[PDB]
Amino acid sequence: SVAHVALPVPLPRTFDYLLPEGMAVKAGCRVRVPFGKQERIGIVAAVSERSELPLDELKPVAEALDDEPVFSTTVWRLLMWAAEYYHHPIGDVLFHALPVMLRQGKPASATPLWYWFATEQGQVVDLNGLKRSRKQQQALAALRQGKIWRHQVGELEFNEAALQALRGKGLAELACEATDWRSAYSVAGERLRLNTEQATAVGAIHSAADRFSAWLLAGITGSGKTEVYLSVLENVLAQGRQALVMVPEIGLTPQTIARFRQRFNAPVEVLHSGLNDSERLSAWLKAKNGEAAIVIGTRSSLFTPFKDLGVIVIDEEHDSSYKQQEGWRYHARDLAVWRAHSEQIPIILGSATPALETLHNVRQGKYRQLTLSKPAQQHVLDLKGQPLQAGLSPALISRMRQHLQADNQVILFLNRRGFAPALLCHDCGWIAECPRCDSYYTLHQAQHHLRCHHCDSQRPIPRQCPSCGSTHLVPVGIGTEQLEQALAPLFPEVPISRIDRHLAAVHRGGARILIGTQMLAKGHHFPDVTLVSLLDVDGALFSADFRSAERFAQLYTQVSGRAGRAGKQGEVILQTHHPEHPLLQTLLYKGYDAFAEQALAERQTMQLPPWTSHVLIRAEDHNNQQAPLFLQQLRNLLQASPLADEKLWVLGPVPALRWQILLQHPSRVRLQHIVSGTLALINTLPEAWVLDVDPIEG
Ligand SMILES: Nc1ncnc2c1ncn2[C@@H]1O[C@H](COP(=O)(O)OP(=O)(O)O)[C@@H](O)[C@H]1O
Ligand SMILES: [Zn+2]
Ligand SMILES: [Zn+2]
């Protein structure tokens, strides 16, 4: 009688409509409803016999677009929970989970694809006639060889006009075409690749395959993590169940795709960024109907429906790209784990450098670890008192030339762009710390001051180091200053190129300097690189962002096993003003896992994630000012709201690395409800504003 309908609007509620008699429609189905004078597509959240709004103002539902729900029960429950946890409007959440074509109210069914083909006559006709009809002979000559899809005519030189003219002469016609892989699926033969550790990992996952279990597959690069994924998948597909494989945004390489395609005598569906809406819907349907054995995709592939999902694999579990930074700011990994729990299936998280969140979860009961085991010389250069050219010390340049004149490649790594730096003395290594809290000052040269972020303290930029008297105070964490402009005159006629995602000149080998700011794609290798230098180690060690050391440790550990693998002797050089920094020392001589153990214990002392939960609230006001006051009002509304516990820790209005406030709490659930209540009632009108649960900051 009454349908509670969700719309793709920035409002956290459902609009009511009347259900005319005869119109069958459950929750999870799409509807066409009136909205003002115009018309809108919506989703039925709930169907009640009851009454909610003024009954007379209730307009009826214009059309029921789906007979059956477009989300499954567990996926539906997942999205309901995600909306509650991320505090994002239920309508936007639900519509974001659907393909574009289904958002627009089109049928949830596979569109037929049509082709032109040469008729019986067109195959034999004297090619002496069309020799005066312009494009039609070219159109038919192509048709002689094979069919031509309609969505490909635009890539050719003859058009639909040339083809429809052949149609009228009876020489071309239009037709379209109509699938069970489980029968005739060969589990492959005993072929016996797996080693001891690999087989144990496969066995352990197999022995618990009929329930939920979150596994961390922790192994260094080359240990054969992918090989375990492939074997696990074989078992799952042997049960006639489907699989989802998630990779980072840059992970869908032709080599990776070919690897999966060749291993499985079963359909593999790849959700890459080049697909159009039809192709995406087609893939969505193939998965929903159980026709796709394996789906490979990136962050959004999490929302794909499955007739019978049997396993989830997330490769490069630590990658940032699993966190959506625009609109609905969900984390694909967490939601995937949630999805695995509700469906009661295994999820396998794979990384050579697992997130601290993940290692914490393993240390506690949450995840189970399966480990895989099975040279590169490293130098630490002291920048203190060194005359730099392009941020490069004499010692590094000396090593660089010895690699370049040997006709080899060199990679330099930097700290992206836009990040706000710390300030230190180039001569004695003094760092600007806040006097109140032991926290590094963030340098704001555009604002002419140093600002604390753990507390809120103002201090002007010193002209000289107060410790040693030197004027050579430098900003650390700046690499956007077009390094090539200084590298070209330092390295004459040597080609300079950027890695960050035509550039097949890298595969040519020879003397070359490569510049990167982010971690490299899986399988994507640089065999001609024999020297890797990590510039601005200080930017990572003295950042206001508490996760910078983690990201650096990951970057360092990745690139530590890519300096010309097996073939040539690789060299890793790090430049820093503090060579004997304890954290850095642990990383360099003990490895990532030991860094992680120490970093994790320091997170506990400082009461930081993953030991606590975080929620950010950002604001962007043109007014540069007043906006902090809006957050000041929101701070006070957050104070006395039921649930104080003298555990809730709120950072007052502090500018970002744009303004923000920070909420911290030992309990994830409690912090959710504190935000739930404070957002339920909002007092002053918002003109300035986003909400970020579990922020990765970067
Ligand atoms: N046991 C193996 N079988 C096949 N290929 C392997 C094996 N070990 C390593 N490789 C190759 O080395 C690269 C990285 O190893 P991979 O098996 O993907 O493990 P990981 O996922 O830990 O990097 C891949 O490109 C892969 O082709
Ligand atoms: Zn401070
Ligand atoms: Zn000094």
From Swiss-Prot:
What segment(s) does the record annotate as region 3'BD?
1-97
* UniProt key word Metal-binding: yes
Note down the stretches annotated as region CTD: 612-698
- Stretches for region WH: 114-176
The reaction(s) catalysed by this protein are: Couples ATP hydrolysis with the unwinding of duplex DNA by translocating in the 3'-5' direction; ATP + H2O = ADP + phosphate + H(+)
Q: Which residues bind Zn(2+) 1?
A: 425, 428, 465, 468
Q: What are its cofactors?
A: Zn(2+)
Q: Which residues form the Helicase C-terminal domain?
A: 460-616
Q: Which GO terms describe its biological process?
A: DNA recombination; DNA replication initiation; DNA replication, synthesis of primer; double-strand break repair
Which residues bind Zn(2+) 2 per the record?
434, 437, 452, 455
What controls how active this protein is? ATPase activity is stimulated by single-stranded binding protein (SSB).
Is Cell wall biogenesis/degradation a UniProt keyword of this protein? no
Which pairs are disulfide-linked?
none
Q: Which function does this protein serve?
A: Initiates the restart of stalled replication forks, which reloads the replicative helicase on sites other than the origin of replication. Recognizes and binds to abandoned replication forks and remodels them to uncover a helicase loading site. Promotes assembly of the primosome at these replication forks. Recognizes abandoned replication forks and remodels SSB on ssDNA to uncover a loading site for DnaB. Binds replication fork DNA, has DNA-dependent ATPase activity in the presence of replication fork DNA, restores normal cell growth and SOS induction to E.coli mutant pirA304.
* Protein name (Swiss-Prot/TrEMBL): Replication restart protein PriA
